[PDB]
Design a protein around this ligand. Structure first.
Ligand SMILES: CCCCCCCCCCCCCCCC[C@H](C)C[C@H](C)C[C@H](C)/C=C(\C)C(=O)O[C@H]1[C@H](O)[C@@H](CO)O[C@H](O[C@H]2O[C@H](CO)[C@@H](O)[C@H](O)[C@H]2OS(=O)(=O)O)[C@@H]1OC(=O)CCCCCCCCCCCCCCC
Ligand SMILES: *[C@@H]1O[C@H](CO[C@@H]2O[C@@H](C)[C@@H](O)[C@@H](O)[C@@H]2O)[C@@H](O[C@@H]2O[C@H](CO)[C@@H](O[C@@H]3O[C@H](CO[C@H]4O[C@H](CO)[C@@H](O)[C@H](O)[C@@H]4O)[C@@H](O)[C@H](O)[C@@H]3O)[C@H](O)[C@H]2NC(C)=O)[C@H](O)[C@H]1NC(C)=O
Ligand SMILES: CCCCCCCCCCCCCCCCCCCCCCCCCCCCCCCCCCCCCCCC
Ligand SMILES: *[C@@H]1O[C@H](CO[C@@H]2O[C@@H](C)[C@@H](O)[C@@H](O)[C@@H]2O)[C@@H](O)[C@H](O)[C@H]1NC(C)=O
Lengths: 99, 275
């Protein structure tokens, strides 16, 4: 079978403009394991990004956590972009500090 | 006691074509990674200073040898038998094996395998049992594995003798980290409108350990049954994140509070007011 990914974006701490935080993109529920995940700042790829080693759930579906330090500002837009064999194009999920 | 009560290793082996297999592997206590695996050399990466538990450096090197030889050997054999088993590329195999401590002191061991993201086999009382979703392929596989010298006896010893020793030893070795209590922070926001004259009240709870947590919206002592909990999501530092949302009328927010209870906060419940 195959499974499309779920994508959840969230900061570690409440956002405070100009204060250092961690931006997280949790990608889960997908199969097969090959996947491409970028964090974006104003539409451009962030270079420094950390991720977990691959793991999977009880139903055999995979999951990964991508994360980077960042400083939220008022202007700057952040997002997670995922590509997977099950998607007819890349999925982009924006960070929204109020969700 | 609190924190994890099980240890397991996983395997993900991805077969692109006859030339190209890749295997990814790791060791876990529940949800917390404690071993990595460097695929190319076939060696373990110990992620915590107590990840060897109470095992000797010699027994650990011997276990890494077992897993190295299993991983390359398995990948080679799969590639060599893919024609016979009518496999189409690409395909992906997964495995999980380990043991778990039950409330009465009983330790139960398990091993399961997958193909195509579906159950393929399991080990039940020392034998290979094919799963229904694996079909005639899984039957063939379990009829074949018993022909290999030492495989089934090694799997037996690792599951039922080695794993329970390792698990009690590492839960004891890592107990200062594993049973630590870490208090969350919490905060409120107004989420995307769920509709005209409605507000989405969001209560965020982040940085708790261990994982079990309780979060509810309230009007004084009254639980709001409309509370929706999100997924518990990981942070990178061995803590978790969760939101609880309540869809409320635009004039009904006042008097509402988010209440958080956690093992680290006994006598210290967090209560946050919207207005
Ligand atoms: C922390 C604790 C947590 C615990 C929880 C985990 C709990 C559970 C974790 C599960 C992990 C399972 C690991 C079990 C694997 C066993 C160790 C991997 C091996 C250990 C060293 C002794 C064993 C008994 C066999 C050895 C050492 C061995 O060398 O085997 C060969 C032996 O070296 C040689 C004489 O030297 O004769 C044959 O080798 C020939 O045939 C092979 C297969 O065709 C060829 O690849 C090989 O080149 C060839 O050599 S040749 O020179 O003869 O041609 C033997 O053939 C053989 O019998 C095959 C051995 C070679 C690897 C083949 C693996 C493929 C099948 C795997 C399916 C099993 C999955 C589980 C399903 C339920
Ligand atoms: C690493 O640690 C393991 C586990 O040891 C224990 O847990 C740690 C944290 C300490 O608190 C120890 O006090 C505990 O013993 C050790 O494994 C065990 O070794 C002891 C000593 O040989 C074994 O105790 C014997 O067990 C017999 C009866 O118990 C039966 O029930 C258990 C339930 O767990 C079952 O697992 C087991 O099959 C037993 O048959 C008894 O004959 C004898 O008198 C004595 O009580 C104990 O059983 C072992 N536990 C397990 C789970 O295997 C390791 O030896 C240690 N080192 C290494 C290198 O592994
Ligand atoms: C432990 C304390 C200190 C040491 C720690 C070292 C830990 C580091 C992590 C190690 C991680 C790597 C090891 C990973 C081992 C995971 C074990 C999980 C076992 C389950 C896999 C079972 C099989 C998986 C399911 C099998 C599916 C088969 C699909 C059909 C393929 C058909 C084509 C050919 C088939 C024929 C092959 C014939 C073969 C003899
Ligand atoms: C076999 O595979 C080689 C590797 O291809 C790829 O690498 C792997 C890890 C996958 O990520 C896959 O998506 C890539 O396409 C090929 O480069 C090679 O040509 C292939 N050989 C033959 C004969 O088909």
């Amino acid at each position: 079978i195959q499974r499309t990914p779920k994508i959840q974006v969230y900061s570690r701490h409440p956002a405070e403009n100009g204060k250092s935080n961690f931006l997280n993109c949790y990608v889960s529920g997908f199969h097969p394991s090959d996947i491409e995940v970028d964090l974006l700042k104003n539409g451009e790829r962030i270079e420094k990004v950390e991720h977990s080693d691959l793991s999977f759930s009880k139903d055999w579906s995979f999951y990964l956590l991508y994360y980077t330090e960042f400083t939220p500002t008022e202007k700057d837009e952040y997002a997670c972009r995922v590509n997977h064999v099950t998607l007819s194009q890349p999925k982009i999920v924006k960070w929204d500090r109020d969700m | 006691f609190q924190g994890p009560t099980s240890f397991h290793v996983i395997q993900t082996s991805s077969f692109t074509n006859s030339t190209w297999a890749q295997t990814q592997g790791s060791g876990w206590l529940d949800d917390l990674q404690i071993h990595g695996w460097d695929s190319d050399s076939g060696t373990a990466i110990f992620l915590k200073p107590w990840s060897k538990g109470n095992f000797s450096d010699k027994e650990v090197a011997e276990l890494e040898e077992i897993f190295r030889v299993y991983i390359f050997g398995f990948a080679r054999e799969v590639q060599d038998f893919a024609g016979d088993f009518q496999m189409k590329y690409p395909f992906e195999i997964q495995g999980i094996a380990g043991c778990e401590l039950h409330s009465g002191g009983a330790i139960v061991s398990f091993l399961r395998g997958a193909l195509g993201g579906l159950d393929f086999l399991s080990v039940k009382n020392a034998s290979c049992v094919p799963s229904p979703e694996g079909g005639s392929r899984a039957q063939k596989f379990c009829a074949l594995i018993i022909q290999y010298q030492g495989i089934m006896e090694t799997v037996r010893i690792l599951l039922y003798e080695t794993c329970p020793r390792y698990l009690l030893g590492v839960l004891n070795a890592g107990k200062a980290d594993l049973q630590r209590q870490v208090k969350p922070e919490a905060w409120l926001s107004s989420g995307p409108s769920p509709g005209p004259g409605r507000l989405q009240l969001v209560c965020h709870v982040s940085g708790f350990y261990p994982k079990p947590v309780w979060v509810m919206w309230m009007r004084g002592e009254q639980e709001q049954q409309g509370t929706q909990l999100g997924d518990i999501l990981p942070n990178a530092n061995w803590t978790w994140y969760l939101r609880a949302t309540l869809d409320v009328a635009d004039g009904e927010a006042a008097g509402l509070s988010c209440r958080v209870k956690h093992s680290s906060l006994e006598g210290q419940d967090i209560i946050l007011y919207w207005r």
